[PDB]
Amino acid sequence: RRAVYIGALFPMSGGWPGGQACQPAVEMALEDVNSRRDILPDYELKLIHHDSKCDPGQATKYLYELLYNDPIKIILMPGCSSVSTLVAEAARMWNLIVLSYGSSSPALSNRQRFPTFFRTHPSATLHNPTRVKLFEKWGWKKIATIQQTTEVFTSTLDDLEERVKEAGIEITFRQSFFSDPAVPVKNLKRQDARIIVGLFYETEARKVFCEVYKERLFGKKYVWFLIGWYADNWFKIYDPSINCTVDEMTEAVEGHITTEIVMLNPANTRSISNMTSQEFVEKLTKRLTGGFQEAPLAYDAIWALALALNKTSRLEDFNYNNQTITDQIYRAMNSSSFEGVSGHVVFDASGSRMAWTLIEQLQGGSYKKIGYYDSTKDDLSWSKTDKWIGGSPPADQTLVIKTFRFLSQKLFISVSVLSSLGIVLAVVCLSFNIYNSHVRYIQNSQPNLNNLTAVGCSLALAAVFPLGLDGYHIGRNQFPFVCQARLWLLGLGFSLGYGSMFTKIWWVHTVFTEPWKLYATVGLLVGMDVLTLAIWQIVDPLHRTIETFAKEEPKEDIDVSILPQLEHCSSRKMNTWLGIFYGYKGLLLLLGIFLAYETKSVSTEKINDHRAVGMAIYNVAVLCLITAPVTMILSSQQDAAFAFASLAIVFSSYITLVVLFVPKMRRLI
Amino acid sequence: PPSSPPLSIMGLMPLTKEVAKGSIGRGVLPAVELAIEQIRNESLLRPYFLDLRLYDTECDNAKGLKAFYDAIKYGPNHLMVFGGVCPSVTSIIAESLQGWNLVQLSFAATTPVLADKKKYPYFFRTVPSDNAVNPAILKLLKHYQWKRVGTLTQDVQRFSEVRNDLTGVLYGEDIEISDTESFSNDPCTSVKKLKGNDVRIILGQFDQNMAAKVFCCAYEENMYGSKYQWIIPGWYEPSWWECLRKNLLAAMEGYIGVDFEPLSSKQIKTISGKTPQQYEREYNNKRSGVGPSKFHGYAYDGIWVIAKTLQRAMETLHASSRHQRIQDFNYTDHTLGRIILNAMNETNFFGVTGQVVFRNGERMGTIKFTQFQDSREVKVGEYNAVADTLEIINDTIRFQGSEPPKDKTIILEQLRKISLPLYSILSALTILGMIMASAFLFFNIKNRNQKLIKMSSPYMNNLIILGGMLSYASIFLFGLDGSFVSEKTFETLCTVRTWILTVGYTTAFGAMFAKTWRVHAIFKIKDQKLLVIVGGMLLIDLCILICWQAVDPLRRTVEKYSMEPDPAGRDISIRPLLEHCENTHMTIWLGIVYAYKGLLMLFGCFLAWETRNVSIPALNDSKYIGMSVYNVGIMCIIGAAVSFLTRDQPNVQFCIVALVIIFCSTITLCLVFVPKLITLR
């Protein structure tokens, strides 16, 4: 029939006015036990309580009434976290014990600095190793945090820091504040970051996001992690202290995320008290949405306490100044362990009796589920109900895509048509002259070499085919087999036919002012160019090379900047090596026109080809003299170097060989 | 004092000498009792007298808190509490007072967070937090006109709050806050992000032991010289530095530290009738071998405050009963605490620290600016803030350079200019072909009467070469900008810069066309016919000219590059600038004229296809004309394209436009009229 007083500290406003009902809840749990006889033969556990508001000052006052003018106590049951953090340091000038049911400030695990403190609400560190998972999942690496600067959190966040430095994640921003939360978010938006973690309380948060809408932080790339042990509607409620509406956060918070912890045993097993969560909840609703998820910890705590008291046995024969009873009961609790409503109710420093967590999303109006998780196995159960306005997670930075500047393939085909026509004409006149290859106005001009001429021109006319194309879906893997193809193809096409006529001209000075000396002269000529090539060609070959311009501002997508790069084969000494080569080749026709200036109105009647010969030669020479510096200089604009480039060649052939045999054709008649 | 109670003081501080802060616990007191003895010798509070009950705190919150409770229960009704030095205890006590109708005052709350009366209403203090330095800093910046900053802190309550006030005070004060970072323990992953902006200024609001790591990474990124000035608090322990010794000692030297001032600098009569020098003499005589304080005279000022504000309080209408209800007060007269607070909200007077007054709670006070002058610290100036002032003294400060390190960059404009000699080289070549033109004039006009003169009325050809010269000296007008130009009439020339070209080419290319047209139309007034032809051609000329010149036709448009320039070797920035001009709409007014002249070519080439079946060799050389025409045709079109596709690099835009024209005009005309000298010779 003995009985012992207790005092204990609860909420009614502020950070967590949830134990409104826990107070009746523990009253229920209390009247549970004095009914039973295995509890205490003599003692009947009594209570005192006071409102605290989670304002430590008022709490300090009520505490003073509790000890100084209050009945003899031994043990205390507080609520929110700051308050415990206080009273633990406060205790040991009385040698008390204390236990909290709600508070998660991890720093309290320091058994040394805090000898006489016990928890059951796990240290909130478990929230974190959840989080990295998503950070490993959706490929996120750079972050900003804000926080209210109480002890409860700062250490939590410092724990975050290392628990991702194991995975090399970066942190690149922090902030802080006490009650004027306005400015650091304004600081954030001007550091442009996409991700947010928050770690704070309700009556801060309403103010926070109220301000946040007035700087437009939501929607596509403004993701927020928060905390889950708020109410389910916290933001909807009247704020008498801002200039905001409802709908603005009803639209602005959209997309955000929460995490919290499962407390009960989710299973279905008879308790020690012949109870289970189902009938538990029924009783709570019977005794009377907000402040409910968290109560059971009492209905574990005090049971554990009284079990300590069955273990231990004078009790009313107590003093603060004594020290021995505390050590007794403290060893008791160090040893204390069993299974109860929440689960394997046992104490340690890791605060990790539990393992099972909860994820939660919000999708337009209220809170919903996505999956669950357990950390011991890194096992993640999912449900596939997510949403993003966009349909996939954004990524903390506008990522750069390195495309290529295409070559406008829609136009390639046109000049390709021109190429085919030139080919037709080439082979036409080819088989033409060789067919009717017996006459005096036909055979007395050596048209074999003219056939060669058209042939080389056909080769360089093919020169559209290889080199007009890289920057579309053409090769992407093996350029060099086609890259170098411009080179071999060129002179084999170009210089040959070009010199094919030159030989003809060579006699008009060298002879008039045979055709094995001649043919081998051409062999010497071509092979001269070719060996002077190969010394640089097969020794110093080229390769596909990439170049890039300045970064740009695309603005043709959701959010990603464009960094174009270009490509074309070149070696490191293409400054003068390549233009002086062009010059070497050009000197030939420079002298060719000198020979023209000689051989005007000097027919000699042997070979019937001088007149428009020189004309065509001039026509070519100017085109080369032009196109070399122009394709050289105008390379960085790859898009239309090709524009002049081969048109020249086309407007060579299509206005070179065309002239060659048309009068000869008309010579038939 | 037997008539009255000893009026309450509840004194809280270190008392032992086990803790270093224990220093302060006794390093201040004797001046406190000194003032007590003064007011004993004066006895203002007649009929009343004062006293204090001292207790221990030890800055382990348990002991001090229990001690507080202890002085409550086992003592009289107290009214006012003095002390609170360690932060954690005062940040506790602050909120517990609203429940007992108290007020407190102390002399160490640098912990700024206490400003929120809505949280911690009944608190007061004398010493200025780190919060009330920012005004000074602002004014400093104004007085040097530094106007760009790179903030930096480290994430804890006591500094982050400073930052989150500074951001709030510079609203409407014409300076920006560009960059920002923060860090917990490892700073260096930030300073280089900051160096990436090359900014010239540092604020730093961070605790002691981290400066090592700070500057150890600074040197490894080398921020020091003149261009980098720094601001730090000054409350560090002097000689605080004991990765590299010399590296720092060379690097750091020349920063600014800043903090609260200990004392004034001026020996004016006080409230007591005394002076600073008197105060410190009384101090050092009052002690023998105890460490010296710095937050003591502030304390003394506060005690005088307590006195005079008490006197303000008891000056009350109902002094009859209140002069006893002092005594029977039972911790609960809410009205009383309201009375006291309303009283002290407007207390105001002088002491060792100048005047001392309150704003929401906080002192208006006095400030020490210091600089680190070659292995020691020295005062540099002073900032009274209540009058929003400043005082700085020459021959005291120093920079490593001499000038105020400007805060942005070596921004420079550097209007580009094409071709130093290109105004000269090719222009002289033009003068060469020009003198050849005049040579042809001389040796042409000489003969004027001969078998060749009748082959062609050479005044037509004189007109041709006239347009030749005109077209041909057009070039220098493109040799214009950069040097020899600031007049802004660039648009004026460009009108001419096309007018000339158009006319010269037009006329001097129609002339021989018409020569041979006449030869044909006679063969298959004579000269004024062709003046009529070109007076009609004027209509095309001027009509297109002015249609282009509808509004202006020429808008001097300065185009800006990426501002990506750093090649001076002078630590500067030159935003590359260039010019251009269009009808301020689109480039359509040009293919018109190119087509108009291609039509001249083609219909003129009707004569060409005639000549291809004319039996040419009678009197003239349209053969000499055709090569010219094909040549110039292709060349002009190339120039036209390549120009507009490269309005960008002008360095060549002026070259190639020259080479086209010079080849055209010269190696057409000259080596065409040469035959007309072969003939004579």
Ligand SMILES: CC(C)CCC[C@@H](C)[C@H]1CC[C@H]2[C@@H]3CC=C4C[C@@H](O)CC[C@]4(C)[C@H]3CC[C@]12C
């Ligand atoms: C003498 C003749 C052969 C010269 C003709 C010049 C031709 C080749 C030029 C003039 C106009 C040009 C076109 C301009 C517009 C377009 C539309 C674009 O979506 C595809 C390219 C295309 C179709 C261009 C291809 C090349 C083009 C047709």
Ligand SMILES: CC(C)CCC[C@@H](C)[C@H]1CC[C@H]2[C@@H]3CC=C4C[C@@H](O)CC[C@]4(C)[C@H]3CC[C@]12C
């Ligand atoms: C005698 C012949 C060779 C002269 C032909 C002049 C050619 C090279 C000129 C005339 C029109 C020009 C084109 C005008 C429009 C465009 C569309 C643009 O998106 C890419 C460049 C491109 C495709 C230009 C490339 C060069 C171009 C094709």
Ligand SMILES: CC(C)CCC[C@@H](C)[C@H]1CC[C@H]2[C@@H]3CC=C4C[C@@H](O)CC[C@]4(C)[C@H]3CC[C@]12C
């Ligand atoms: C008689 C005919 C063939 C002469 C025609 C002259 C032509 C070739 C000239 C006159 C106007 C010129 C164009 C002027 C403007 C542009 C736009 C630019 O972005 C690409 C080049 C391009 C497209 C030029 C190409 C050449 C061009 C089309």
Ligand SMILES: CC(C)(C)c1cc(C(C)(C)C)c2c(c1)[C@@](O)(C(F)(F)F)C(=O)O2
């Ligand atoms: C190259 C080749 C076609 C032989 C040629 C080159 C010239 C240039 C003066 C431009 C060098 C030339 C002629 C022919 C003419 O016979 C003419 F027909 F153009 F008149 C002439 O004297 O000028």
